[PDB]
Amino acid sequence: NVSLIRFSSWMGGDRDGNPRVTPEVTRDVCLLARMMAANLYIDQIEELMFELSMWRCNDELRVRAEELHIPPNEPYRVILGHVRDKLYNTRERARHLLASGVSEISAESSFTSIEEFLEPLELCYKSLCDCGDKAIADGSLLDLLRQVFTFGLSLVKLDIRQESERHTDVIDAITTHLGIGSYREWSEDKRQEWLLSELRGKRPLLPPDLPQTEEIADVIGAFHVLAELPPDSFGPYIISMATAPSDVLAVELLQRECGV
Amino acid sequence: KHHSIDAQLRQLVPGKVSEDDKLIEYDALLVDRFLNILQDLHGPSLREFVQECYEVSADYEGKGDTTKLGELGAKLTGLAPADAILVASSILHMLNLANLAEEVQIAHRRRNSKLKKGGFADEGSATTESDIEETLKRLVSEVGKSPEEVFEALKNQTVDLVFTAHPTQSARRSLLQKNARIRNCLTQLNAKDITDDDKQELDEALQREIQAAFRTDAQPTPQDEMRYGMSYIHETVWKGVPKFLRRVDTALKNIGINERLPYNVSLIRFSSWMGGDRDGNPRVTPEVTRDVCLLARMMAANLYIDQIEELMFELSMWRCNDELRVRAEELHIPPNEPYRVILGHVRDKLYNTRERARHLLASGVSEISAESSFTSIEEFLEPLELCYKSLCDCGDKAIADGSLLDLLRQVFTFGLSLVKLDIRQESERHTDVIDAITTHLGIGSYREWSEDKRQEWLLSELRGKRPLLPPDLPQTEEIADVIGAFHVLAELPPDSFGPYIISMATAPSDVLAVELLQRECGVRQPLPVVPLFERLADLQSAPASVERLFSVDWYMDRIKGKQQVMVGYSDSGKDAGRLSAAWQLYRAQEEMAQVAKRYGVKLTLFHGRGGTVGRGGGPTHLAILSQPPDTINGSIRVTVQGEVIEFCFGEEHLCFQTLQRFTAATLEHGMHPPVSPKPEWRKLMDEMAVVATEEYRSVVVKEARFVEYFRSATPETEYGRMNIGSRPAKRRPGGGITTLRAIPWIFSWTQTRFHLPVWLGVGAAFKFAIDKDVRNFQVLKEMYNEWPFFRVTLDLLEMVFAKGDPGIAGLYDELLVAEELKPFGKQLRDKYVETQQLLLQIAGHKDILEGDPFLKQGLVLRNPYITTLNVFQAYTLKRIRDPNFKVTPQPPLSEYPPGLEDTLILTMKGIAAGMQNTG
Amino acid sequence: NVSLIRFSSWMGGDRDGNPRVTPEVTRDVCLLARMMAANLYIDQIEELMFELSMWRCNDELRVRAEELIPPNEPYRVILGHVRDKLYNTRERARHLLASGVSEISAESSFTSIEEFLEPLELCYKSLCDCGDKAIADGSLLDLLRQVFTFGLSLVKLDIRQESERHTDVIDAITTHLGIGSYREWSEDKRQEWLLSELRGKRPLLPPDLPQTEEIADVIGAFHVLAELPPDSFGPYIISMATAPSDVLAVELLQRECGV
């Protein structure tokens, strides 16, 4: 479970001075990553099923293998077969969400978290150890657990990046529309004072009928995509040309006001 | 827990057989790690027990003294049931590991031409045999054929290898892959300049794979047994045949031919008996045959889908000719990669081909149209050959001659069904059907008719235009099985099948009976009918039977100048002994070829189990070269016995060498036959055959107490009651031993390390020949060194004697046979000893297998595990058979009575695994 | 169960001097009739389901309804299963009509009149056992009378062909077999030969028989009759029948073509 190495991507997340890389581009590369991961895991699991022909298992695994009922004297294959089924569903759900935007394939029939993916694999590992077969567990199955803890369900986590003046543009559109004045004209100290009174307050800010330029709509739309996608799809939100604390605090306010 | 097992191995074989001999090192590496795993899992005491068993049995080979075996048997019988299975299976797993090391050593042994002495004897071992290009060079320069003659001989060659089920072991695909990982870890560990850390990790992997094989284990369906028979095709042969055909290209270049073997040349084909052989096997129903045919087509479709998808990845080119560009436009991912668009369509149709078969298999019906799938080999190849031509037309022939040429050679080798299914049934079952027809129609009893009357009636029906089989016909279960089988053949595509083989064929009416049944059951593309001549008399009259068939206008019209005949070694050897069977088989072959030549018929021989051809490794090379002149001519079928299939095809390089062996030997024989026997040799073989048959029958047929001895000295009865052959052991519930079938006959006698069916008769014949004329002894050894037939025959006996041990046989005797018959057993063992030493003096060897130290070493290193299972078996039988034999139940060490059946199965499996092919 | 009135059809079966009526046309109208019957039955059953909301049933029906939408409405449970099997029966016919083959199993559908009747007669008995025979004698009785009147194909198909077309087929057989010309034989000789074949136990029709377009149509029609359910058909009518051999010839051809 030690994540000694992890992998991230900017491709579809970095939009600094790149007007293609829309909100939907970001939604797309996220679902594409999850399909690729499901494919890689399905192959690893199938090779592992071939290998794990054993019949001796602990009680916990024997019980769950019975509940999943090809041959029942091959318990590790029964469990991993179920894992493969849920991985197939995870992939197809992602493919449907990518094409139509919608999937009749339930999230229950698929893997939504790394924790529920890990549960049957660690069950296999502990069962093999409990039967004195830790040496077998420390082969291919240990490789697979290390892949899960390295790559997750999306291979890479996506970094988002956007220039600081684009966030200032959005907030100046908000403050002028509300009649509070021009956030752009304010000094850095005044900006921090206002941002902190908003983040400390409990009343929302972003009006749904805010008049939006193409650029402003792209910033707000991007945040809206972040709110709709699973948190483990993302890493950090990077602010290009950051100059001052208000740059960081402004993104924290937009992120909240757009529902992340 | 401490010492290594290699000290005991060095006592067996002092000295290396080659410089790169590391077989004992490998055996120690695997077994030492296994024993450490054993101890980690089950404690030290049983590990030391198991190793002591191995040490006792290893000592025995060096000092043939039975009492130490009895010591061991006392210890073994006292083990609690759980410990008995554990020790037996442990010894089995160690034998497996030793066989894997033997495989690694063969595969990676450097060829050393200094071992060659010239002449045909070089072809009897892989250490000295000629590869395909050495054979090509010899044919050009020594024999004097032109490169173009050799090139066209190859273009017309076809070697057909026939898979048959393994009597005792399954060969799951997942186990073949554990084997490979153990072999790979072994070779990689012993690589040149390997890192400390690489070696550490490879060691851990090896220990891991050995444990995984140790921790994994009702008879199988005939469907399942077929799925397991196809494992070797998935693991080596599929990729192997393109690799070998590419070597044939390289060889042709190196004798001056500047073109590859055309990809439509079926140089090697593969057939199967699994699901088609129903001779005395009622579980092989019509439905089983329909199933294995559809199963094969699914396996082929998925292998092709994989090849095609790999090929799509590679063929990203955009340059194509006009025919391909127009077709790619018509199929309308990116359109600027036309080869991917064609192959994507081919993959689509292959997916439908697979799903259609799956539906027919489950429901019996498919709404997937045959139009949307591939129905013939021809429509599969049309788009592939279009891709090949297009690449060539654009100057990319070099690319075409890569993966795409591999695929085309796979299509022409494997077709849409991987293997062609042979059908086999006993002749009397066809007679039963025809008698049912003739009596129901009221024209008499076909069974009561003489052979000449049968032929007269059959021919009038075959020549007439009126149907014969009424759908009303009253049917037994067996008659309904025969008719139902023909009805399945009529319903399936003709390319699913090869021949229809008639077991126990004796006369032309047997062949023409099947021709009539085929037609009257509606088989519109009839199968070639192949008689299997089993008994000595049937072999003697086979040239007459084949001449009568060839003299019938209707039959010549049917066969179109092609006839296949099957010959059986274990079958004929059971009738009259191996020596007499060997010689009649030679004569029958040369006279049948003479008949065929006169009538313009191309005669192909199919070599059944137990033969010299079909031995593992080099011996098959010489065996094929030794067959009578002008009996092959580029066409031969050979069964791949289950006992040797692992050594022949389990490993990449072994697969390659096997394909090369059959291809080279078959090619050379057609242009370079062995010497014709000189009259002195023929007369001597004639006289020795009389004596050998007489003494074989003296023990087998005419001695009243033989069957009683056989049922006690062997585990036959248990082998039958446990259905280890997945087949009835006998045809009638009584009869002599003449009713017993060959597989049980050979199996039971090799379990006891005695091997009577292989050698009995030879001793009497050798001594008779030497004693009746002083000159005969020198002419016998002259035969051994100048007559390949005699050499090959005798080398088979030598190999079997290396696998035999009279002490072990006598151990079965002393505990299992009644006092009254023990002198009979020692009489037989006296015949054994006299045959062996007479065998050694001819050939001029002081020791067994002195001419092949490599084979001697490989065989000897198996016996510690085998002999251990031998004593475990003998004592297990005595417990199974005698309630009064008392055992001291020893405390634990972490059907029939408890555990005894499992133990006995394990000994049977292990002894068979160690003994592989005998007779 | 009294079939006081039955209905037959000549359409797609009569081919007397009518080459448009091919074996395929006969196979088609037989499956079309089965689709029409399934549709009419599905509507009747659904109307019946609406009416039979009772909860009182006998034990045979209660058990069958617990096996196999609300369980308090057992007659609707049974009739809902019938409708499922009727829809399968129709789809199977539609597939055979278009493709010639159907992966819809005959088990999941109704293959005989009696297996269609079994659940309906169970409902009728159950209603009677609960003193509801009056309700049984309404719509459920009408449906049962429809089943015994129309079957699973609405109508039974008559086949008709002219006797000389059958003579043509038999003369082709006797000449090809080299036993003479059935056409030139007198009536008495035809009867003598036909009877020896009908009484004999050896088949007659060679699969290699050279066939004209007309002879192939006759043999092909018989092959269609052999492949379809027996309850799709009524009689085989011989136009221009003049003598017993006309009838006996069709009996021979029916058998040798596998009916």
Q: State the catalytic residue, choosing from B178, B574, B607, B669.
A: B574
Nearest to B81 by CA among B694, B735, B899, B860: B899
Half-sphere exposure of B714 (CA within 13 A, CB side): 23
Burial degree of B405 (CB within 10 A; 0-12, 13-18, 19+): buried
Contact C103/B363, CB-based, under 8 Å? yes
Please, where are the H alpha helices in chain A? Answer: 23-51, 59-67, 75-99, 114-130, 134-136, 142-151, 164-178, 188-200, 214-228, 245-257
Q: State the catalytic residue, choosing from B145, B166, B430, B909.
A: B166
Coil vs helix vs strand at B672: coil
Residues 6 or more apart whose CB falls under 8 angstroms from that of B98 comprise B27, B30, B31, B861, B862, B865
Nearest to A163 by CA among A21, A14, A38, A5: A14
Coil vs helix vs strand at A238: strand
Distances (CA, A) of B71 to B49, B65, B676, B822: 13, 11, 54, 21
- Closest Cα of chain A to B25: distance in Å? 24
Half-sphere exposure of B644 (CA within 13 A, CB side): 25
Burial B733-744 (b: 16+ CB within 10 A, else e): eeeeeeebbbbb
- Number of Cβ within 10 Å of residue B614's Cβ equals 25
Residue at B842: amino acid letter: I
Strands B562-567 and B602-607: parallel
Interface partners of chain A (CB pairs < 8 Å, 3 or more) are B
Rg (CA), chain A: 24
- Rounded-to-integer distance, Cα B122 and Cα B287, Å: 48
Q: What distance lies between CA B855 and its chain's CA centroid?
A: 19
β-partners of residue B160 are B269, B637
- Rounded-to-integer distance, Cα B227 and Cα B796, Å: 31
Catalytic-residue membership of B234: no
Longest dimension (CA), chain B: 88
- Rounded-to-integer distance, Cα B94 and Cα B902, Å: 18
Distances (CA, A) of A13 to A96, A258, C20, C175: 21, 17, 70, 87
Which two tokens mark C74? Answer: 């057992």
- Rounded-to-integer distance, Cα B300 and Cα B419, Å: 9
> In this complex, which of B367, B472, B522 lies closest to C101 when CB atoms are compared?
B367
Contact A138/B211, CB-based, under 8 Å? no
Coil vs helix vs strand at B522: coil
Residue at B631: amino acid letter: T
On whether the CB atoms of residues C10 and C158 are closer than 8 A, the answer is yes
Nearest to B126 by CA among B139, B116, B118: B116
Catalytic-residue membership of B166: yes
Residues 6 or more apart whose CB falls under 8 angstroms from that of B907 comprise B88, B869, B870, B872, B873, B876
Distances (CA, A) of B548 to B510, B554, B556: 12, 12, 11
- Rounded-to-integer distance, Cα B350 and Cα B380, Å: 9
Q: Which chain A residue lies closest to B215 (C-alpha atoms)?
A: A54
Residue appearing with tokens 């599905």: C42
Interface partners of chain B (CB pairs < 8 Å, 3 or more) are A, C
Burial degree of A187 (CB within 10 A; 0-12, 13-18, 19+): exposed
Nearest to B300 by CA among B390, B403, B415, B221: B415
Q: What is the dihedral of CA C103, C109, C115, C121, to 10 degrees?
A: 170
Which two tokens mark B504? Answer: 């126990």
Coil vs helix vs strand at B492: coil
- Closest Cα of chain B to C202: distance in Å? 6
Nearest to B671 by CA among B8, B37, B153, B92: B153
* N-to-C CA span, chain B: 40
- Rounded-to-integer distance, Cα B194 and Cα B225, Å: 41
Q: What distance lies between CA B278 and its chain's CA centroid?
A: 18
- Rounded-to-integer distance, Cα B561 and Cα B556, Å: 7
B16 phi, psi to nearest 5 deg: -85, 145
How long is chain B? 919
On whether the CB atoms of residues B242 and B406 are closer than 8 A, the answer is yes
- Rounded-to-integer distance, Cα B34 and Cα B52, Å: 15
Nearest to B293 by CA among B486, B482, B489: B489
Which two tokens mark B102? Answer: 């033997």
On whether the CB atoms of residues B577 and B690 are closer than 8 A, the answer is no
In chain B, count H helices and then E strands: 42, 8
Residue appearing with tokens 């004045």: A181
Residue at B495: amino acid letter: D
Q: Method used for this model?
A: X-ray
β-partners of residue B425 are B502
Please, where are the H alpha helices in chain C? Answer: 23-51, 59-66, 74-98, 113-129, 133-135, 141-150, 163-176, 187-199, 213-227, 244-256
> In this complex, which of A50, A56, A136 lies closest to B211 when CB atoms are compared?
A136
On whether the CB atoms of residues B222 and B394 are closer than 8 A, the answer is no
> In this complex, which of B369, B465, B470 lies closest to C202 when CB atoms are compared?
B470
- Rounded-to-integer distance, Cα B271 and Cα B639, Å: 9
- Rounded-to-integer distance, Cα B315 and Cα B708, Å: 69
On whether the CB atoms of residues B644 and B99 are closer than 8 A, the answer is no
- Number of Cβ within 10 Å of residue C158's Cβ equals 17
Burial A75-107 (b: 16+ CB within 10 A, else e): bbbbbbbebbebbbbbbbbbbebbeeeebebee
Chains B and A touch (3+ CB pairs under 8 A): yes
- Number of Cβ within 10 Å of residue A213's Cβ equals 11
Task: Assign 3-class secondary structure to B735-778.
Answer: CCCCCECHHHHHHHHHHCCCCHHHHCCHHHHHHHHHHHCHHHHH
The 8-class DSSP code of residue B260 comes to: P
B600 phi, psi to nearest 5 deg: 75, 20
Residue at A151: amino acid letter: F
Distances (CA, A) of B889 to B74, B886, B892: 10, 9, 9
| Percentages (nearest 5) of helix, strand, coil residues in chain A | 60, 5, 35
Q: What distance lies between CA C12 and its chain's CA centroid?
A: 14
Contact B212/A56, CB-based, under 8 Å? no
On whether the CB atoms of residues B743 and B907 are closer than 8 A, the answer is no
- Rounded-to-integer distance, Cα B157 and Cα B159, Å: 7
- Rounded-to-integer distance, Cα B416 and Cα B304, Å: 9
Distances (CA, A) of A15 to A219, A258, C132: 10, 18, 77
Distances (CA, A) of B423 to A259, B284, B488, B845: 72, 10, 11, 44
B618 phi, psi to nearest 5 deg: -50, -40
β-partners of residue B531 are B502
Contact B366/C103, CB-based, under 8 Å? yes
How long is chain C? 259
Residues 6 or more apart whose CB falls under 8 angstroms from that of B837 comprise none
Q: Which chain B residue lies closest to C92 (C-alpha atoms)?
A: B367
Residues 6 or more apart whose CB falls under 8 angstroms from that of C13 comprise C21, C26, C29, C157, C158, C159, C160, C233
Residues 6 or more apart whose CB falls under 8 angstroms from that of A233 comprise A30, A33, A34, A154, A157, A158
Which two tokens mark B305? Answer: 């889908």
Mutate to test the interface with B, among C103, C252, C254 (most CBs of B within 10 A): C103
β-partners of residue B502 are B425, B531
Which two tokens mark B12? Answer: 């067996």
